């Protein structure tokens, strides 16, 4: 959970908003009002309960997606996934892969 990490999460949200919403990134009153409205939306979105995500779950979703979209790099993804799992960093690898699967296009 995000308990105890609110400061670091909000600092990241500030960065995201400026990077992805240029009209909300400036120093004038209107831009700063837009930033506050966007910030409040992001906070609300991150409170939404979401689904029961059960891990090989995201990687299995990504692989089966990649046989339809773009089969030429299915093997490449599988080798990348294996490398990632072996790294001594990141405690939430399943969730980062879930994020990528959700943004896959």
């Amino acid at each position: 959970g995000p308990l105890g990490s609110m400061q670091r999460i909000n600092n990241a949200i500030d960065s995201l908003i400026g990077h992805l919403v240029p009209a909300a990134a400036g120093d004038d009153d209107d831009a700063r009002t837009r930033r506050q409205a966007v910030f409040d939306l992001v906070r609300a979105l991150l409170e939404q309960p979401g689904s029961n995500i059960p891990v090989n779950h995201a990687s299995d979703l990504i692989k089966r997606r990649l046989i339809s979209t773009n089969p030429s790099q299915a093997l490449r993804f599988s080798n990348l996934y294996t490398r990632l799992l072996a790294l001594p960093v990141l405690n939430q690898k399943w969730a980062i892969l879930y994020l990528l699967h959700q943004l896959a296009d």
């Binding site: 009209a23 979105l45 997606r65 960093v89 990141l90 939430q92």
Partner: protein, 79 residues
């Protein structure tokens, strides 16, 4: 944590971004390294990844659609 382990973990963190950005490219996620690294940070701090994916989608809409950004502001001010 001794210097050797800190250095190894910092080097592995950089490889993690390289690997995850190549995966993101294969999947056509349209994420640059900056946005990926922010997302990694939030997820490692406990943020729900399905919610974060919605956040990215909505920020993209707001950044491309002034109508929706102004509608968001109107809703915010009315609260």
């Amino acid at each position: 944590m001794p210097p050797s382990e800190r250095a190894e973990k910092q080097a592995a963190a950089q490889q993690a971004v390289d690997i995850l950005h190549e995966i993101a490219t294969i999947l056509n996620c349209h994420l640059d390294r900056r946005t990926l690294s922010i997302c990694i940070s939030m997820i490692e701090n406990g943020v729900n990844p399905e919610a974060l994916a919605n956040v990215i989608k909505e920020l993209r809409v707001l950044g491309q659609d002034p109508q929706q950004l102004d509608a968001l502001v109107a809703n915010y001010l009315a609260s």
